[PDB]
Amino acid sequence: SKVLVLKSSILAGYSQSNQLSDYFVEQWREKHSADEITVRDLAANPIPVLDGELVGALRPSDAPLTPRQQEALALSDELIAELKAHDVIVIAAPMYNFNISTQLKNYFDLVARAGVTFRYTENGPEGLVTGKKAIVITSRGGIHKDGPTDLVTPYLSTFLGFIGITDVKFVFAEGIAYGPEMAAKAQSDAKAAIDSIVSA
């Protein structure tokens, strides 16, 4: 089995979601030591913003590409081939200003291509990234789970389902900003959630 781990926090070593993702990788290596694990850090190695030039590479028209466009198409091809090559997809999704981090958003914007990761049919869209199992590790300062201020969870569920990844489990670490006690309990509960996932 091959595991891809996507890190998207801007807080580096202090990141709650990067710490839980590392715990995830540690546990998986112990319990399934034959599996290869690939870790991509979307903050350390940023994906460019999808602008008018880059959208012209992914939704091309009848003209030669610019060198920048060609480079963005190569990066997009590389990210998609990596996504399709792996079985278990662990996505670190910190909440910043009620959304996912731009670092993760830029990744998703290069991964979503018609005829590559999805296509529209007469019955609606069909996802082309098939047979995957995803785990979202999502950290928040406050408590939002199951309430009107959590658009991150349904958004991730919607975008992932769109490209074909409909088996998604969520690990939450909420209330981090209430203090070190609340954060430690949040981390211990998340680690126990990760344990059940790794041991299944």
Ligand X SMILES: Cc1cc2nc3c(=O)[nH]c(=O)nc-3n(C[C@H](O)[C@H](O)[C@H](O)COP(=O)(O)O)c2cc1C
Q: What is the Cα–Cα distance from 109 to 127, expressed in whole angstroms?
A: 15
The Cα-based distances of 172 to 16, 59, 116, 118 in angstroms read: 11, 35, 31, 28
- Give 3 or 183: the residue with its C-beta nearer to ligand X: 183
Q: Which is closer to ligand X, CB of 35 or CB of 53?
A: 53
Q: Got the DSSP string for 174-200?
A: --GGG-HHHHHHHHHHHHHHHHHHHT-
Min. distance of Cβ 95 from its own copies in angstroms? 11
Minimum CB distance to ligand X, residue 68 (Å): 17
User: What would the DSSP string read from start to end of 18-66?
Assistant: HHHHHHHHHHHHHHTTTSEEEEEETTTSPPPP--HHHHHHHS--SSPPP
Closest separation between CB of residue 72 and ligand X, Å?
A: 13
Residue 62 beta carbon to its own copies: minimum distance, rounded to whole angstroms: 15
Does 75 participate in binding its own copies (rule CB under 8 A)? no
The residue among 136 and 194 lying less far from its own copies, judged by its C-beta, is 136
Among 87, 98, 188, 192, binds its own copies (CB under 8 A): 98
Q: Which residues contact 99 (CB under 8 A, 6 or more apart)?
A: 105, 151, 152, 155
Task: Please list every residue from 5 through 44 that binds its own copies, using CB under 8 A.
Answer: 10-12, 43
Q: Is residue 85 near its own copies by the rule CB under 8 A?
A: no
Is residue 114 close enough to count as binding its own copies by CB under 8 A?
Answer: no
Contact residues for its own copies, defined by CB under 8 A: 10-12, 43, 46, 49-52, 55, 96-103, 105-106, 108-109, 112, 148-149, 151, 154-155, 158-159, 162
